[PDB]
Amino acid sequence: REVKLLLLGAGESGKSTIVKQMKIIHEAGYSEEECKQYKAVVYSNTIQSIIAIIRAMGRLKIDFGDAARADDARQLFVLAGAAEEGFMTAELAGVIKRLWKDSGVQACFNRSREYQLNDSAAYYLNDLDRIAQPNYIPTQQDVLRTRVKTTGIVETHFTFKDLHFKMFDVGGQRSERKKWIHCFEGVTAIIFCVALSDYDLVLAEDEEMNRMHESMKLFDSICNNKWFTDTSIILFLNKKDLFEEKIKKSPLTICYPEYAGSNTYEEAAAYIQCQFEDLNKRKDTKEIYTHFTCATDTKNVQFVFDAVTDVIILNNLKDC
Numbered sequence: 001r002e003v004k005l006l007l008l009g010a011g012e013s014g015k016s017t018i019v020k021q022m023k024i025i026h027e028a029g030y031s032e033e034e035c036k037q038y039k040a041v042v043y044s045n046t047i048q049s050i051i052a053i054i055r056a057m058g059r060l061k062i063d064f065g066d067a068a069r070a071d072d073a074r075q076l077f078v079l080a081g082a083a084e085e086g087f088m089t090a091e092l093a094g095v096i097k098r099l100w101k102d103s104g105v106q107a108c109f110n111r112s113r114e115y116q117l118n119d120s121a122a123y124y125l126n127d128l129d130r131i132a133q134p135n136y137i138p139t140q141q142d143v144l145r146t147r148v149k150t151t152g153i154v155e156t157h158f159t160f161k162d163l164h165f166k167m168f169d170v171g172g173q174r175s176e177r178k179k180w181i182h183c184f185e186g187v188t189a190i191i192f193c194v195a196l197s198d199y200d201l202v203l204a205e206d207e208e209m210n211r212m213h214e215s216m217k218l219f220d221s222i223c224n225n226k227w228f229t230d231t232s233i234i235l236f237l238n239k240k241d242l243f244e245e246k247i248k249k250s251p252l253t254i255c256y257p258e259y260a261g262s263n264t265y266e267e268a269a270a271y272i273q274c275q276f277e278d279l280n281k282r283k284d285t286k287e288i289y290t291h292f293t294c295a296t297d298t299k300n301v302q303f304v305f306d307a308v309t310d311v312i313i314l315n316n317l318k319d320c
């Protein structure tokens, strides 16, 4: 019997990363050939991240910590074209490594809410020696950590607990929202993804809009749409790993000026959960199933998706 799951949520909330985890958990992972297809995506993501930080240093007027890095930044652009084609020379890796270690680059990196930077930037840039090896093959985590904006509708199938799942993934940026309705028929459950760590960020599409406010508006729209009255609504409050680190140092009042809790994970995570669950206009007749997730962590997603599946089996799959 069949289960249709629809992943919704704003840009970069983690939807496509959950799709990848289904392949890893239920279909034995990415093969060597599949992993090699992501090599140019890893190198592209790495190059674009250090270039984004270097672009921002001009905008924010941040100097390199060491003047010698000015020539490394020149060579970055001379050499960058290779990474884009799947090649990563020792020379290019050296240049990126010295840039990434510079104190002015780090000062800019630690101000990334002021610009747009991929969440996996530090992941890849801290792992340069490893990804620049001859005959590097991306790991499962390297594949999970890649970032490519979704611009169509993606359908993946897998079997789990004797059920045939069809999982649908669509893009969440504003340009792609018009396509969500093509996926609205026959949905067993929506998995609505929220990036917890987006509370102090602005939209890539619009620098005046707070990313978490955008996510709230989208959840209010979906959760309360009467077309989905008998579709289970699962809320993944995702990027809990990034949120744990950010809440130590970036005030939640950027997003919610009435927040009176401390700069700690449990209080702030519960507060955000309550802000989204409060958007439900029919609290006694519509249940939200909320999980806190780290979509790049296979063990977390495995146990959370096991729990989610058990609920769907109980609620949606009786045989009359």
Ligand SMILES: Nc1nc2c(ncn2[C@@H]2O[C@H](COP(=O)(O)OP(=O)(O)OP(O)(O)=S)[C@@H](O)[C@H]2O)c(=O)[nH]1
Binding pocket: 009, 010, 011, 012, 013, 014, 015, 016, 017, 018, 118, 119, 120, 144, 145, 146, 147, 148, 149, 150, 151, 170, 171, 172, 173, 193, 238, 239, 240, 241, 242, 293, 294, 295, 296, 297
């Ligand atoms: N550290 C960490 N990174 C995450 C988590 N979830 C997703 N990412 C990373 O964030 C980036 C965006 O995730 P992605 O899955 O692409 O978002 P999306 O919702 O599909 O985005 P879109 O297609 O609507 S633009 C990727 O680099 C992914 O690896 C998480 O929980 N923790």
Ligand SMILES: O=S([O-])[O-]
Binding pocket: 174, 177, 178
């Ligand atoms: O999302 S708008 O283009 O209808």
Ligand SMILES: [Mg+2]
Binding pocket: 015, 016, 017, 148, 149, 150, 169, 170, 171, 172
């Ligand atoms: Mg996507």
